[PDB]
Amino acid sequence: SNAEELQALVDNIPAAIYHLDVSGQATIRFRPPAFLKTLVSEHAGTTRLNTLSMIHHDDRHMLSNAYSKLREAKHSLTLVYRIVTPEGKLHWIEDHMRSSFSDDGLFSGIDGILCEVT
Amino acid sequence: SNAEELQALVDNIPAAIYHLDVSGQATIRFRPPAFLKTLVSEHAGTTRLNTLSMIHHDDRHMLSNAYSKLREAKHSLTLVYRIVTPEGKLHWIEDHMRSSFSDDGLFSGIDGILCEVT
Numbered sequence: 020s021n022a023e024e025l026q027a028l029v030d031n032i033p034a035a036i037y038h039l040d041v042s043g044q045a046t047i048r049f050r051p052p053a054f055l056k057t058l059v060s061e062h063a064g065t066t067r068l069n070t071l072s073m074i075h076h077d078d079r080h081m082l083s084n085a086y087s088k089l090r091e092a093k094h095s096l097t098l099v100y101r102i103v104t105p106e107g108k109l110h111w112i113e114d115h116m117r118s119s120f121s122d123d124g125l126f127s128g129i130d131g132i133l134c135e136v137t
Numbered sequence: 138s139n140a141e142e143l144q145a146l147v148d149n150i151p152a153a154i155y156h157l158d159v160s161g162q163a164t165i166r167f168r169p170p171a172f173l174k175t176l177v178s179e180h181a182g183t184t185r186l187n188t189l190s191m192i193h194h195d196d197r198h199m200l201s202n203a204y205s206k207l208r209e210a211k212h213s214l215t216l217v218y219r220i221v222t223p224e225g226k227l228h229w230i231e232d233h234m235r236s237s238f239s240d241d242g243l244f245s246g247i248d249g250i251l252c253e254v255t
Contacts, residue, residue, distance in 0.1 A: 022152055025150050028146075029147055032144075032147055032170065033143075033171070033172060033255075034143035035170055035186070036144060037186050037249050038247070038248055039234075039249060041244060041245065043189070045187075045188065046184060046185055046186065047177060049184065052150065052152065054151060055151075059165060063182070064183070065165075066164060066167065067162070068153070069163075071161070126159060128159050130156055131154070131157060133152065133155065
């Protein structure tokens with residue numbers, strides 16, 4: 020898939036941006052893709068993805084339909100939808116999703132890889 | 138440079154791994170390169186790079202010499218050195234470093250990009 024390809028590619032690059040401060044402390048710098056720079060939040064020392072509140076209104080029923088499908092069965096799907104940001108920028112998203120389940124057949128969340136289409 | 142090339146490449150990939158939990162909360166997953174998996178620490182919700190304590194003993198004077206150079210002048214340098222991990226694994230590192238300074242001509246730390254050589 021257009022997006023799986025991409026990440027299989029990030030996973031092979033053995034590179035890491037770091038910053039070393041004056042006191043000798045090296046901290047790894049993690050940057051989301053540029054377009055995502057403004058679309059994420061800090062919470063509990065973890066990066067949040069605010070992208071779901073941004074789905075274009077005409078793309079919402081589709082997306083939600085896909086969620087129901089994944090919630091009830093172990094699927095992989097690829098979705099394309101638009102998002103509109105706070106600052107009115109429009110982006111086409113390719114979003115690959117994989118459903119997951121607990122040992123007990125319980126739904127345990129979704130693992131995704133998303134990219135901008137251009 | 139061997140490593141600058143690499144990251145210029147990560148910076149262009151508009152892909153992001155995320156996890157969406159059962160309560161609707163999407164968190165971006167940040168993974169260091171595999172070899173680095175075991176070589177980083179969690180601290181203050183930020184990832185630490187424990188790689189400097191691992192420099193091979195025969196590579197230490199060199200590296201430290203480079204630090205003195207960067208500390209006194211805005212330089213970019215590329216260093217290659219070995220590290221030995223807790224579990225005795227040996228890795229060749231290419232490490233590109235850029236010196237930085239405060240408005241007042243004060244040394245303000247080092248910005249680097251490092252990769253495994255193979």
